[PDB]
Design an enzyme around this catalytic site. Structure first.
Site, PDB file in Angstrom:
ATOM      1  N   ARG A  23      41.036  22.574  24.666  1.00 51.30           N
ATOM      2  CA  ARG A  23      41.315  23.560  23.627  1.00 51.30           C
ATOM      3  C   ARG A  23      40.111  23.850  22.732  1.00 51.30           C
ATOM      4  NH1 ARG A  23      42.776  26.389  21.325  1.00 51.30           N
ATOM      5  NH2 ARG A  23      44.090  25.689  19.595  1.00 51.30           N
TER       6      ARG A  23
ATOM      7  N   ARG B 241      48.414  17.963  21.651  1.00 52.23           N
ATOM      8  CA  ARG B 241      47.250  17.370  21.017  1.00 52.23           C
ATOM      9  C   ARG B 241      47.247  15.844  21.050  1.00 52.23           C
ATOM     10  NH1 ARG B 241      43.900  20.882  19.154  1.00 52.23           N
ATOM     11  NH2 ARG B 241      42.659  19.300  18.042  1.00 52.23           N
TER      12      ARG B 241
ATOM     13  N   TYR C 224      59.887  34.467  12.739  1.00 51.64           N
ATOM     14  CA  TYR C 224      58.428  34.503  12.634  1.00 51.64           C
ATOM     15  C   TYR C 224      57.915  35.848  12.230  1.00 51.64           C
ATOM     16  CZ  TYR C 224      57.876  29.819  14.264  1.00 51.64           C
ATOM     17  OH  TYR C 224      57.971  28.463  14.370  1.00 51.64           O
TER      18      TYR C 224
ATOM     19  N   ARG D 150      56.523  19.723  24.750  1.00 50.00           N
ATOM     20  CA  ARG D 150      55.133  19.642  24.310  1.00 50.00           C
ATOM     21  C   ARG D 150      54.339  18.547  25.006  1.00 50.00           C
ATOM     22  NH1 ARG D 150      57.243  22.427  20.641  1.00 50.00           N
ATOM     23  NH2 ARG D 150      58.634  22.348  22.422  1.00 50.00           N
TER      24      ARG D 150
ATOM     25  N   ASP E 236      52.906  30.281  24.656  1.00 49.70           N
ATOM     26  CA  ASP E 236      53.551  30.125  23.378  1.00 49.70           C
ATOM     27  C   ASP E 236      54.662  31.135  23.205  1.00 49.70           C
ATOM     28  OD1 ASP E 236      53.566  30.625  20.121  1.00 49.70           O
ATOM     29  OD2 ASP E 236      53.053  28.582  20.796  1.00 49.70           O
TER      30      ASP E 236
HETATM   31  C1  LIG Z   1      56.885  25.727  25.071  1.00 54.26           C
HETATM   32  C2  LIG Z   1      55.683  25.697  24.142  1.00 54.26           C
HETATM   33  C3  LIG Z   1      55.708  26.006  22.833  1.00 54.26           C
HETATM   34  N1  LIG Z   1      54.456  25.898  22.309  1.00 54.26           N
HETATM   35  C4  LIG Z   1      53.624  25.483  23.326  1.00 54.26           C
HETATM   36  C5  LIG Z   1      54.355  25.350  24.477  1.00 54.26           C
HETATM   37  C6  LIG Z   1      53.812  25.031  25.869  1.00 54.26           C
HETATM   38  C7  LIG Z   1      54.380  23.824  26.581  1.00 54.26           C
HETATM   39  C8  LIG Z   1      53.518  22.612  26.284  1.00 54.26           C
HETATM   40  O1  LIG Z   1      52.605  22.768  25.400  1.00 54.26           O
HETATM   41  O2  LIG Z   1      53.794  21.531  26.875  1.00 54.26           O
HETATM   42  C9  LIG Z   1      52.152  25.225  23.194  1.00 54.26           C
HETATM   43  C10 LIG Z   1      51.589  25.039  21.809  1.00 54.26           C
HETATM   44  N2  LIG Z   1      51.632  26.015  20.794  1.00 54.26           N
HETATM   45  C11 LIG Z   1      50.954  25.574  19.675  1.00 54.26           C
HETATM   46  C12 LIG Z   1      50.482  24.320  19.973  1.00 54.26           C
HETATM   47  C13 LIG Z   1      49.659  23.419  19.058  1.00 54.26           C
HETATM   48  C14 LIG Z   1      48.246  23.678  19.589  1.00 54.26           C
HETATM   49  C15 LIG Z   1      47.104  23.038  18.828  1.00 54.26           C
HETATM   50  O3  LIG Z   1      47.334  22.485  17.727  1.00 54.26           O
HETATM   51  O4  LIG Z   1      45.969  23.115  19.361  1.00 54.26           O
HETATM   52  C16 LIG Z   1      50.852  23.986  21.300  1.00 54.26           C
HETATM   53  C17 LIG Z   1      50.570  22.656  22.012  1.00 54.26           C
HETATM   54  C18 LIG Z   1      50.831  26.399  18.402  1.00 54.26           C
HETATM   55  C19 LIG Z   1      52.163  26.583  17.717  1.00 54.26           C
HETATM   56  N3  LIG Z   1      53.090  27.484  18.199  1.00 54.26           N
HETATM   57  C20 LIG Z   1      54.203  27.510  17.435  1.00 54.26           C
HETATM   58  C21 LIG Z   1      54.032  26.607  16.414  1.00 54.26           C
HETATM   59  C22 LIG Z   1      55.060  26.221  15.343  1.00 54.26           C
HETATM   60  C23 LIG Z   1      54.942  26.880  13.959  1.00 54.26           C
HETATM   61  C24 LIG Z   1      55.882  26.326  12.880  1.00 54.26           C
HETATM   62  O5  LIG Z   1      55.490  25.297  12.244  1.00 54.26           O
HETATM   63  O6  LIG Z   1      56.987  26.873  12.615  1.00 54.26           O
HETATM   64  C25 LIG Z   1      52.750  26.008  16.627  1.00 54.26           C
HETATM   65  C26 LIG Z   1      52.106  24.956  15.735  1.00 54.26           C
HETATM   66  C27 LIG Z   1      55.387  28.420  17.767  1.00 54.26           C
HETATM   67  C28 LIG Z   1      56.266  27.734  18.781  1.00 54.26           C
HETATM   68  N4  LIG Z   1      55.866  27.481  20.073  1.00 54.26           N
HETATM   69  C29 LIG Z   1      56.929  26.881  20.746  1.00 54.26           C
HETATM   70  C30 LIG Z   1      57.975  26.737  19.889  1.00 54.26           C
HETATM   71  C31 LIG Z   1      59.367  26.123  20.161  1.00 54.26           C
HETATM   72  C32 LIG Z   1      59.651  24.867  19.269  1.00 54.26           C
HETATM   73  C33 LIG Z   1      60.900  24.101  19.665  1.00 54.26           C
HETATM   74  O7  LIG Z   1      62.031  24.550  19.334  1.00 54.26           O
HETATM   75  O8  LIG Z   1      60.788  23.034  20.333  1.00 54.26           O
HETATM   76  C34 LIG Z   1      57.563  27.292  18.659  1.00 54.26           C
HETATM   77  C35 LIG Z   1      58.487  27.342  17.459  1.00 54.26           C
HETATM   78  C36 LIG Z   1      56.977  26.420  22.166  1.00 54.26           C
END
Ligand SMILES: Cc1c2[nH]c(c1CCC(=O)O)Cc1[nH]c(c(CCC(=O)O)c1C)Cc1[nH]c(c(CCC(=O)O)c1C)Cc1[nH]c(c(CCC(=O)O)c1C)C2
Ligand SMILES: Cc1c2[nH]c(c1CCC(=O)O)Cc1[nH]c(c(CCC(=O)O)c1C)Cc1[nH]c(c(CCC(=O)O)c1C)Cc1[nH]c(c(CCC(=O)O)c1C)C2
EC number: 4.1.1.37
Lengths: 357, 357
Positions: free
Chosen positions: A41, A32, A155, A28, A77
């Site tokens: 974003r 944010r 999910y 990540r 994602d």
């Molecule tokens: C690889 C990756 C992910 N998400 C994002 C990336 C891109 C790489 C990067 O951002 O650096 C962007 C990425 N995706 C999201 C965000 C947050 C964006 C925002 O708040 O604006 C970002 C930076 C949205 C998101 N997307 C997801 C969630 C989690 C939901 C839960 O609580 O169970 C969330 C909050 C699904 C998700 N997405 C991901 C996972 C793997 C978690 C792990 O095992 O480390 C999962 C479970 C992986």
């Protein structure tokens, strides 16, 4: 094709070769915690951002302008795959991802697309990868990724995050047939998607089994591990058959302590670790023929810069210089200070060099 | 729109009209020689400063609070254009600008943006211009600017400054096709950017061909001059078509002695001169139908205030009162004394009035 790779330290480490220092990236790293991420974003909804190659490229590059990270990971994602299968998904402010119509009975599988057409629905991801690979201009390798089948299943059935995965586990125990059907649909969607990411320019692949820890060994072996194995086997086969060079593959099973031995035999070059496993114990479980990635507690970055340095020293001492890529044990949190992320990166580089001379 | 211009001496001179005195401005008048510039810059990295309309406005205004200069130039940089094309650029302490991944082969052009989208990426520049035009409140005209195509090409290929431009010139001789392609991409990016600067409030435009002198006449005529001509022609055309008043355009080709005759025919109102060309010789080359700008050796400002006055007298005597804007022959250096800059400004004003009555 593409610019010649200039810093290949990450790839050499992934394949198990000696390097001059320990490469580091942060899960990540586009997130944010960066003010500039929040700004980029602000213009679109999350899935619309994911659909814009330029926005994805910009978000990927942002951390690399701040920190000398040894790899970039494409902004996307894991939930793009269930979306491409025909499920509607939203991002809800402060709550996270939601599927308003989760899969609850076996008949619900009828609405999914044939998995063979999913890659065609994810063309936007490949566009982002190609663009980012070009714009990176060889600086460091670009990682592609997807969610593991079980994690995606959770999910799709839960309709979002969950503390227990009780509905998804109820499928495993009460609907084992339908569960295997769904897990196979996901595997069959994932393989061409992952292959397409490499065709598009990805230089490594990471599979996130984020919800591993809810299963425990017996269920994990029946319902998660066979599909984790199938993804790696089929991806490497298709790449060979296409005339392409296979890439190093990473499996990260969060809270998967109990599966480490099996994961080191599952056909992945690298096994990613959460912060709850002591590095020396992990090395014992996985053996000497895979690379480990991880595993600093992300919350450690709340400590002072000096303290981060000492924690990093200890971590590196425990992992040793060989067959190791430094990272956190989970993604960076939104309230973390970018300067402290910088301190982590700098300390890995500084101390890993001291540990070689 | 904007406040009525109160002192238009610079514009009248640029268009070739008689004025009551010779107008003067200094290249790099916003620069490190001012303690207050150093203070304002201390808060952010260079390109982040460029991205802040208020910081740019403050830096532009600072010299005008010290000296009665007859023009302001917007605080920005020529390298915002290659950045907006998709190249990563840094400012390195004591070394200057660097592109860590310069263009080295023809395939590297693939990573650049379509030039038609560059102006949209430079919105921050236009914001700075509009803000500065408002805050100047009509005091003096505001100059916008960009780098000429060849000069920008040299940064993009060399990856920074260079004493020989050997890599960029190797492109001209070994890759002429790819060079023309790149020079056209730059021209096509520059035109809408320059037009946008005028739309945003710029009252004149200066194109900096800083690296002219490395070429010599044959190469300059093949690879620099056609694009210098195209920029001026296309900018004036687009402004007409938009219903806007075209602005006076200045071409400054440092060390471009050999190109003066051609530059006076290239569609620019004003030709800027370095300190190596004797003013009387320059007037001979360019003729009577363009305005000359320059050309005092910036190092002359190391001399005493009295000595600066005599050097300025001599310079003004040589240029004559008509079709002339006073300036240095290159930008102010960081170690120069602001009081001596003041002496230069005061001497131009004082002696140019004596030379009329
Ligand atoms: C690889 C990756 C992910 N998400 C994002 C990336 C891109 C790489 C990067 O951002 O650096 C962007 C990425 N995706 C999201 C965000 C947050 C964006 C925002 O708040 O604006 C970002 C930076 C949205 C998101 N997307 C997801 C969630 C989690 C939901 C839960 O609580 O169970 C969330 C909050 C699904 C998700 N997405 C991901 C996972 C793997 C978690 C792990 O095992 O480390 C999962 C479970 C992986
Ligand atoms: C017009 C302009 C420029 N730079 C700056 C301005 C704004 C106007 C003003 O500052 O008064 C701010 C401007 N830009 C920069 C600075 C120095 C800032 C600092 O040290 O904090 C300033 C004041 C950074 C910079 N930016 C650049 C360099 C030179 C690199 C080399 O050695 O080849 C440098 C050192 C690129 C550049 N930038 C520019 C040129 C044209 C030179 C000429 O022909 O007169 C060039 C070649 C033009």
């Amino acid at each position: 094709g593409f610019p010649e790779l200039k810093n290949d330290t990450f790839l050499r480490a992934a394949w198990g070769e000696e390097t001059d220092y320990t490469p580091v990236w942060c899960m990540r790293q586009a997130g944010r915690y960066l003010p500039e991420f929040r700004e980029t974003r602000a213009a679109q909804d999350f899935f619309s951002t994911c659909r814009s190659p330029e926005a994805c490229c910009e978000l990927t590059l942002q951390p690399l302008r701040r920190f000398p990270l040894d790899a970039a990971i494409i902004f996307s994602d894991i939930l793009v795959v269930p979306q491409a299968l025909g499920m509607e998904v939203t991002m809800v402010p402060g709550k996270g991802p939601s599927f308003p119509e989760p899969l609850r009975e076996e008949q619900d599988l009828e609405r999914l697309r044939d998995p063979e057409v999913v890659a065609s629905e994810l063309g936007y991801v490949f566009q982002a990868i190609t663009l980012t690979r070009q714009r990176l201009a060889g600086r460091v390798p670009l990682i592609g990724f997807a969610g593991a089948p079980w994690t995606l299943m959770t999910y799709m059935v839960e309709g979002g995050g969950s503390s227990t995965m009780a509905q998804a586990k109820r499928w495993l125990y009460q609907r084992p047939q339908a569960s295997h059907q769904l897990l196979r649909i996901l595997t069959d969607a994932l393989v061409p998607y992952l292959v397409g990411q490499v065709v598009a320019g990805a230089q490594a692949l990471q599979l996130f089994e984020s919800h591993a820890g809810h299963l425990g060994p017996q269920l994990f072996n029946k319902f998660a591990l066979p599909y984790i194995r199938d993804v790696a086997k089929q991806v490497k086969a298709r790449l060979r058959e296409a005339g392409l060079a296979p890439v190093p593959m990473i499996i990260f099973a969060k809270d998967g302590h109990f599966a480490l031995e099996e994961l080191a035999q599952a056909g992945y070059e690298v096994v990613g670790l959460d912060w709850t496993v002591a590095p020396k114990k992990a090395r014992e479980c996985v053996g000497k023929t895979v690379t480990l990635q991880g595993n600093l507690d992300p919350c450690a970055l709340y400590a002072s810069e000096e303290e981060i340095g000492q924690l990093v020293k200890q971590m590196l001492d425990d992992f040793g210089p060989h067959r190791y890529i430094a990272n956190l044990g989970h993604g960076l949190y939104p309230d973390m200070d970018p300067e402290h992320v910088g301190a982590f990166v700098d300390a890995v580089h500084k101390h890993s060099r001291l540990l070689r001379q």
